[PDB]
Design a protein around this ligand. Structure first.
Ligand SMILES: NC(=O)c1ccc[n+]([C@@H]2O[C@H](COP(=O)([O-])OP(=O)(O)OC[C@H]3O[C@@H](n4cnc5c(N)ncnc54)[C@H](O)[C@@H]3O)[C@@H](O)[C@H]2O)c1
Ligand SMILES: NC(=O)c1ccc[n+]([C@@H]2O[C@H](COP(=O)([O-])OP(=O)(O)OC[C@H]3O[C@@H](n4cnc5c(N)ncnc54)[C@H](O)[C@@H]3O)[C@@H](O)[C@H]2O)c1
Ligand SMILES: NC(=O)c1ccc[n+]([C@@H]2O[C@H](COP(=O)([O-])OP(=O)(O)OC[C@H]3O[C@@H](n4cnc5c(N)ncnc54)[C@H](O)[C@@H]3O)[C@@H](O)[C@H]2O)c1
Ligand SMILES: NC(=O)c1ccc[n+]([C@@H]2O[C@H](COP(=O)([O-])OP(=O)(O)OC[C@H]3O[C@@H](n4cnc5c(N)ncnc54)[C@H](O)[C@@H]3O)[C@@H](O)[C@H]2O)c1
Ligand SMILES: O[C@H]1[C@H](O)[C@@H](O)[C@H](O)[C@@H](O)[C@H]1O
Ligand SMILES: O[C@H]1[C@H](O)[C@@H](O)[C@H](O)[C@@H](O)[C@H]1O
Ligand SMILES: O[C@H]1[C@H](O)[C@@H](O)[C@H](O)[C@@H](O)[C@H]1O
Ligand SMILES: O[C@H]1[C@H](O)[C@@H](O)[C@H](O)[C@@H](O)[C@H]1O
Lengths: 337, 337, 337, 337
């Protein structure tokens, strides 16, 4: 008896989730899609031979009682709207980042879920299902390196478009680190501070690139985090955690080594999409399985999406100030531990 | 409209395929299982909450017209029997290695499939779906290193049981290399030759371990291949292909690096099962998808299973002779290219 | 016709230079040693079978006209005294770090050398002769990665003594990075800023360990630099330079890899002395050779020692202030380019 | 009081030893050189500003009582002549490989040294002084991986000249492995067997390239050894030793890693000379030091040179026969352990 899923937002990553659920995972199907370009969410239904109803809007989709779960995977701001609706409609919502564009918007969503008595919100912070990050998590839980003291990490991308702006670096990009990092160390962030190095020749004039970002936590962990999205050479994610008695570090994507013309190479990816393909799969599948065999969602909480929003805000605030901004977090509700 | 699958042989790897098809892949279900220990193939139906009929034997299972595909995943010799039946019953057969224990048994199976006009036989040589081996394949197809000249490889295992015998090394074990190697280089084997090094202290008395194995091909490619199944340190697969202008080499399983107490370590697996978990998944899924969207199977042919059998035989013949045995292969039928 | 060398300061590193010059390098000998513990200098002359005169003090040694070059390898704050003397005595001075303990003390030494018309001062910043750092230098000079934008680096040590204090971290330790880094990028430092993470359990109570240190340059290069001297696992130097179009990174000390008990290890050094043994050798030898075939010294200038002093000061100033200190450098004298 | 050294054979490697002893090592000088092109030896004495006598022949040089040690660095088949002379002249001989071109020629040289009562012969098998091979040696001596069972290794070179012939592969080239390998495992060779793979496009027509070479020892260790001297990509030495409980493997030459245009490279050498530069240095220096402080030579014995000769012969015998040749070794003289 499979899980009936409605996708709100048949975009490019909305299309990747539809294709994975259709042709790759187990125990779910797409029965309902709405888009704001109604013709596109009608191109998608034909393209993946779906048996789905095309709604003009989220409301008429959440209306349908066929659907017990929605993928929210449209624009960055048109999320908070759709999520809040689906919480009251008593459906299961998987929400792609961001949870909502504003810190309070996340808070309004937390409050709703608290009422509704059980977890229906999973935030699409896929890094927690990547095997690399799980091994890291594993070791830290086992105290392998003892108490964590520093973290060094990088999020690098070959080039970006004309539509890519100085804040997107802390909003669209550094956001995943922001999630995965505190997940790992089990601490709350206590201050951000941006620092701009020399501007890159590959960066457009309207964009500040690269940029370091330093983050203290309550415990005393210090994290410097490089974001450079015009690095030209590849898409590359790096994370090294120094602890009291040792160091653990994230792996490279598996590659065949080559020996040719003087050099001993491995391979570096160019397409951000390709880097996490398998964590997407594991992540959705866990949404499904966690529902059919538990009656609630499992992954990153709606609260975790709030911490992202607060800290993303702290960042963009230090981006234009050059100062050491703060991260104030409202008390963690009992509903969450 | 899903694919209805009958598993003949609810063993330990029969159980892994059932669990993957049930809870991990898309577009198939298990409706029919038979085992020779009828109570075990009744423990399995309860354990994975299946909706399946428990048959006393293959015949009564192939009888059922619910099932259009069988997993043959029981004993090593009780394969040739079940496969040949399912070819005449006009079902789709996925067969775990070996195809059949004897070289002619593979030949009897080829002849049957040739009649039946289309490919219904996929042999479970999973290495072709491991991302490592695909990258290797990719590079060779692109002539990256030019013409292949030598191959060095190893199949190593921590320890083995009392039931593990000197021939199983070339039959159960070196068999995958034997498949994947000629797949890659696109050549037929022309001679084997075993060579025994000093016996290991970890090997039991009744077993010869390690052993090198040298294989020429028609083209002139030379392959030495180490098999050491009491290596004690881990399960480890290595393959390096030297060519005219360069060298390509298989990767290590992804690992987090650690720095602690003098050493800079990564991690090595202990459980042969864990090494290929993802190629199993991709492999089954491709059986399914290749059927529902093509009306035939895709992967390794029944012919490829024959080449395994001939060459496995050539080996065990050189195992007890100490001589340079030959590999004679009947002409490749037009039905196959 | 060999080079006649006087060692002022027959300490433990004074002794290593004496042993290398005696039994390892070419074209020089020790003919004169003074120490402040006069008995230790006589026991040294006997230990390495030298043909040398034991002076009571630097002055009587610089007096001797046998000697045309001195190694100053005495207790730290003793350097400025001895160097200034040897500049007026018109000898060649090789000075171990620091050049002098105070920024102006370096300035007094610069002014003296400017008068004396030729370079007689080489500062013992050996990192410039390590093959790793030379390869880095090479690449940057060839614009391989284009314009440098960031640098990440680490200086880690297993444990330290009771005599090791919170400033020694920026004075004895981070000092080599401070030299080698601006050498590489060809830029002057423009600001330091210390940041203290959680204190380590391996650090004594009187010591702040670890600590990050952030350094901007004039050009815009940003450098974070970790110093952790109770890291427990080994002695380890790391330096990664990110540029506009690529990344270059320093190597590990050569090691044999091992496969044993689950892990795939290389080796990490424990003794800070062992890490640079071969740069010391190359460095002294270049002092010698550069003299006998040029009539002046070659390596790091007395000026470069001044930049270390200014910047070392900037650091210890930001160490106790928690603020973003500045690095003001007097104009580079024409005598130096 | 330095060591007075006569070089017989002022060739290209004769010249490298002269330059190292003159300008790089400690406690020795060149006072006497002879060459068969007498004009080349006079031009050498001028080039390196030596204080040396130019003899017309070895005899008149060994005549001189100034010299107490000779480097024999002359054309290959010229060695046996000069060495035997210098043994009777009672001088110290450092002999570059080969010791002598024929197996009995080595035997004649062993017999002479046995009479003369002390070791004056050091064979120039430098691999024993390379830090890699020393680490390997170290581990094996400590039983890290337990009992050695197999060895895989490779000697690869970019391209060779027109003067490079199918036997030089086992004579000039595989000879160093032949020495270093039995040194390491502490065993005598018991059989060789050549095997030719597909001929390379980079190899000239008159040369068979690559070639495998399989060597059993008495103990049961099996060694396959690849020689490919037109591999085109670099000069590359690889050696992996598999043992009962683990695997140890030789390192790569230290390199800076680069990230650029899709790839994560290190560097591979092109010039065979550059690979061992530091083992040459350590090797000569140990000749010197071992003499001045022991009154005999230390390194590889004249016996070890004989084992190379026997085994080199065994190989070239299996090179043209395609058969499994044998290695018969006369009893090891008590003079040698
Ligand atoms: N977690 C990750 O690593 C990751 C990766 C990529 C994208 N994303 C996120 O996914 C979301 C979409 O990403 P994209 O790059 O595919 O964007 P996209 O432009 O392809 O998708 C937006 C689509 O949604 C539609 N739309 C907007 N508002 C809607 C609404 N209220 N109801 C129905 N349809 C609506 C638009 O017509 C458009 O087709 C973004 O929030 C982005 O941040 C996350
Ligand atoms: N491709 C691979 O890497 C790989 C890995 C593991 C196992 N295998 C293969 O899978 C097969 C089974 O492996 P296993 O280790 O799980 O063995 P197993 O002992 O667990 O499975 C055998 C089972 O089949 C049953 N059986 C025997 N003949 C039967 C028949 N004719 N009809 C129905 N049931 C029958 C037995 O009762 C038993 O339960 C073997 O051929 C083995 O070589 C392949
Ligand atoms: N650059 C490097 O790689 C490096 C490495 C290690 C040490 N050092 C530095 O080198 C210097 C010496 O180090 P060390 O470990 O040998 O010190 P040490 O304490 O072991 O020895 C110093 C010796 O010099 C003598 N001495 C002090 N002042 C003197 C003077 N004015 N005249 C004559 N003798 C005097 C002392 O009696 C003592 O015997 C220090 O500044 C140290 O920090 C540099
Ligand atoms: N072990 C190693 O790492 C290593 C490395 C390179 C070369 N080698 C070997 O060293 C030897 C010399 O190599 P090379 O490259 O210098 O050779 P080369 O051809 O460049 O020079 C040989 C020189 O010695 C002279 N000579 C020959 N016979 C003589 C004799 N009887 N008396 C005096 N002079 C004589 C020649 O005139 C010539 O000038 C060869 O056997 C070579 O294979 C060993
Ligand atoms: O949202 C994505 C992604 O998270 C990366 O930060 C960046 O490489 C992409 O260009 C961006 O659009
Ligand atoms: O069939 C398996 C496998 O293919 C391996 O060769 C070996 O490690 C196992 O023990 C064997 O039983
Ligand atoms: O450069 C070194 C290094 O920092 C060591 O950690 C310290 O013990 C030494 O005193 C110093 O000279
Ligand atoms: O040891 C070397 C090596 O094998 C080179 O490939 C060869 O050119 C030299 O002649 C030989 O001495």
């Amino acid at each position: 008896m499979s899980l009936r899923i409605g996708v709100i937002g048949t975009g490019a990553i909305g299309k990747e989730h539809i294709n994975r659920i259709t042709n790759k995972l187990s125990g779910a199907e797409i029965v309902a899609v709405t888009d704001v370009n109604q013709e596109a969410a009608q191109k998608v239904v034909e393209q993946y031979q779906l048996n789905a109803t095309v709604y003009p809007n989220d409301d008429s989709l959440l209306a349908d009682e066929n659907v017990d779960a929605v993928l929210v995977t449209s624009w960055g701001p048109a999320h908070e709207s759709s999520v809040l609706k689906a919480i009251k409609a008593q459906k299961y919502v998987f929400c792609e980042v961001p949870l909502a564009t504003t810190a309070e918007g996340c808070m309004r969503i937390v409050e709703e879920e608290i009422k509704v008595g059980k977890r229906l919100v999973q935030v699409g912070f896929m890094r927690r299902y990547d095997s690399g990050y799980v091994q890291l998590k594993e070791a830290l839980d086992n105290h392998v390196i003892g108490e964590p003291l520093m973290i060094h990490c990088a999020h690098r991308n070959p080039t970006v478009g004309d539509n890519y702006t100085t804040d997107m670096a802390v909003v669209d990009t550094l956001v995943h680190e922001i999630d995965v990092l505190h997940w790992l160390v089990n601490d709350d962030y206590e201050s951000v501070q941006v620092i701009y190095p020399k501007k890159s020749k590959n960066a457009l004039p309207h964009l500040k690139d690269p940029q370091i970002v330093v983050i203290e936590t309550k415990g005393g962990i210090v994290i410097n985090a490089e974001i450079y999205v015009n690095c030209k050479y590849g898409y590359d994610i790096q994370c090294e955690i120094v602890g009291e008695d040792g160091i653990i570090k994230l792996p490279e994507p598996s590659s065949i080594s080559l020996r040719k013309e003087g050099r001993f190479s491995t391979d570096i990816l160019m397409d951000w999409q390709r880097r996490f393909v398998a964590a997407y799969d594991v992540e959705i599948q866990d949404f499904i399985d966690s529902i059919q065999k538990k009656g609630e969602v499992s992954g990153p909480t709606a609260w975790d999406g709030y911490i992202a929003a607060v800290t993303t805000d702290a960042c963009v605030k230090a981006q234009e100030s050059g100062q050491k901004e703060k991260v104030e977090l409202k008390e963690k509700p009992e509903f969450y531990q």
